Amino acid sequence: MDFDAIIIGAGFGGLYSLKKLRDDFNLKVRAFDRATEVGGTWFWNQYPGALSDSETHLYCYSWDKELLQEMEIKRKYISQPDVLAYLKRVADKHDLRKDIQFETGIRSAYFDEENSFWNVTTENDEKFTARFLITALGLLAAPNLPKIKGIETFKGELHHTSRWPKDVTFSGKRVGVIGTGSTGVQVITAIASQVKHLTVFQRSAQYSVPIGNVVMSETDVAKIKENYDQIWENVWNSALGYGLNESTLPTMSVSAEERDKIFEKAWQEGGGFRFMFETFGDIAVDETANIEAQNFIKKKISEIVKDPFVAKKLTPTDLYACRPLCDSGYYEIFNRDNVSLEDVKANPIVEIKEDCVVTADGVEHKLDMLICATGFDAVDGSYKRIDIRGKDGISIKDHWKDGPNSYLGMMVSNFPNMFMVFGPNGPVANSPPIIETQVRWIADLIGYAEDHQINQIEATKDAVDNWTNTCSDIANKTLFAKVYLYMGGLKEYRNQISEVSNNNYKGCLLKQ
Numbered sequence: 001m002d003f004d005a006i007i008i009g010a011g012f013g014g015l016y017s018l019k020k021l022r023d024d025f026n027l028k029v030r031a032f033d034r035a036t037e038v039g040g041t042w043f044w045n046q047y048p049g050a051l052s053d054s055e056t057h058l059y060c061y062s063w064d065k066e067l068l069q070e071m072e073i074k075r076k077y078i079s080q081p082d083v084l085a086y087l088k089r090v091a092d093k094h095d096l097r098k099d100i101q102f103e104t105g106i107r108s109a110y111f112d113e114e115n116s117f118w119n120v121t122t123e124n125d126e127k128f129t130a131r132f133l134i135t136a137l138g139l140l141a142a143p144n145l146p147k148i149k150g151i152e153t154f155k156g157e158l159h160h161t162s163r164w165p166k167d168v169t170f171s172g173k174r175v176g177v178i179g180t181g182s183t184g185v186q187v188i189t190a191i192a193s194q195v196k197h198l199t200v201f202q203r204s205a206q207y208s209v210p211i212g213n214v215v216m217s218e219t220d221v222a223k224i225k226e227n228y229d230q231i232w233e234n235v236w237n238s239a240l241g242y243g244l245n246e247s248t249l250p251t252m253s254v255s256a257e258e259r260d261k262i263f264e265k266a267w268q269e270g271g272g273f274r275f276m277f278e279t280f281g282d283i284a285v286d287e288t289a290n291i292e293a294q295n296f297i298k299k300k301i302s303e304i305v306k307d308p309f310v311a312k313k314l315t316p317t318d319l320y321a322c323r324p325l326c327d328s329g330y331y332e333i334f335n336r337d338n339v340s341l342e343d344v345k346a347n348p349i350v351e352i353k354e355d356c357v358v359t360a361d362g363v364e365h366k367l368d369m370l371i372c373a374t375g376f377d378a379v380d381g382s383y384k385r386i387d388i389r390g391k392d393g394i395s396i397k398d399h400w401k402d403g404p405n406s407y408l409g410m411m412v413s414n415f416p417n418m419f420m421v422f423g424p425n426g427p428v429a430n431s432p433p434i435i436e437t438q439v440r441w442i443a444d445l446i447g448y449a450e451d452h453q454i455n456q457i458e459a460t461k462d463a464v465d466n467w468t469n470t471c472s473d474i475a476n477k478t479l480f481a482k483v484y485l486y487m488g489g490l491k492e493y494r495n496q497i498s499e500v501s502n503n504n505y506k507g508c509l510l511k512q
């Protein structure tokens, strides 16, 4: 054994995995990332307007009290360069880089049934052994590059938001953006005013609410820092972990005039999760409540966008409101004389030539730059791109050929000593609280094993099948996926995994 534990990922999930196992448990551990710096997705995604979905004071670690007091809280939400600097500062303080090997992908990890440890091989064919594998792998980008005929003949700049280069300049250029998910909304709002002309190619109009990202006064920051203990106590006690007053008020239980008042209030403060969960308690459950949320945003769209035909094209049709987008002036962009909206569901892209994008009606859209706002992959994907083989050498690709499944979102049957952080079938909540929860739980279980010299931990097939049903029970009660995620929220997730730890890890296969 080279190591007690090998960590893959130096993002949020891997940086804390490392800190927890090396320093609070005195294990020998080494971590690996392909990146040249810590930060994970905040290192790779440097596109214009990249901004957190959670507010600054909560998109961070809770476990280091003196870091909370030290933290710079510039704006209500935190931009990508600032998150990256924060993660780097976490590394400086807790001396984590000496145990991270950068520029090092992992090609494969094979479980050794004979000695109960993992054989892990880099892409440069270096081989390390470790009792425990910790996978903190995040989500890769969704669509590689758009499967469009002739895209490779394009002779202008072709930029993917997940490999955004440095020194992109926009002035004097005709620019095109494929994609209008969260990443596309941020790019487009960021660059519309910098280009000579912007063409947006929207496949599918989405609902978006104001983010309301404002500067924080020194007294604003003091309010938070003086009460940080209560703030975090409210995170652990909530469903989402976003600092919201999570409503229980049914949408249809009030007058139209009161209902308009409550949505307006969330709209003025900003934030997608606020609009969806702080206004009423059933927007994501009741079809009739959801339509009320839909119409409020549709009306706002039609009041902000002055040209009714452009506004009509922006209006989501039939689509229900699920998974919340926010923006810093998105719908306003479309009143600008230098912006055009192309509905590419009505008028698909058929071809890309050397100087242009051409749609089904024959029109050539001439472009100097084409931006592919990639989105994000189901993941699953990040795991299916490492050769992971457990017992009798089944690959993870085979074991999940028909969808991912796990125990509590962290352990996979047939894959012992492997613990996933922020993996499939996990909760839907603010990420750092989820990551912290899972890392402390994993670390506690590895300590139990250390004290009781057990060297093979594994989830049964039945713990995993019970977990798959717990998720489908909760999920088939929601408008979402109308599954593969636990949606009882953060507090109920922490119960689930407390019961297991308090019942000598019922469902697990402690061995030796």
Ligand SMILES: Cc1cc2nc3c(=O)[nH]c(=O)nc-3n(C[C@H](O)[C@H](O)[C@H](O)COP(=O)(O)OP(=O)(O)OC[C@H]3O[C@@H](n4cnc5c(N)ncnc54)[C@H](O)[C@@H]3O)c2cc1C
Residues within 6 Å of the ligand: 008, 009, 010, 011, 012, 013, 014, 032, 033, 034, 035, 039, 040, 041, 042, 045, 050, 051, 052, 053, 054, 055, 059, 104, 105, 106, 107, 136, 137, 138, 139, 382, 385, 386, 421, 422, 429, 430, 431, 432, 435
């Ligand atoms: C612009 C943007 C804004 C976001 N805002 C929010 C938000 O407000 N709230 C929220 O909850 N979530 C948000 N997210 C989601 C975000 O992914 C999570 O918050 C969190 O950062 C995930 O951290 P992680 O360490 O688990 O994953 P990552 O940060 O992606 O870490 C994955 C790392 O592991 C490395 N890795 C993977 N595989 C391999 C391999 N085979 N070999 C070597 N190395 C490897 C990767 O290169 C990567 O560096 C946002 C994402 C983006 C892009």
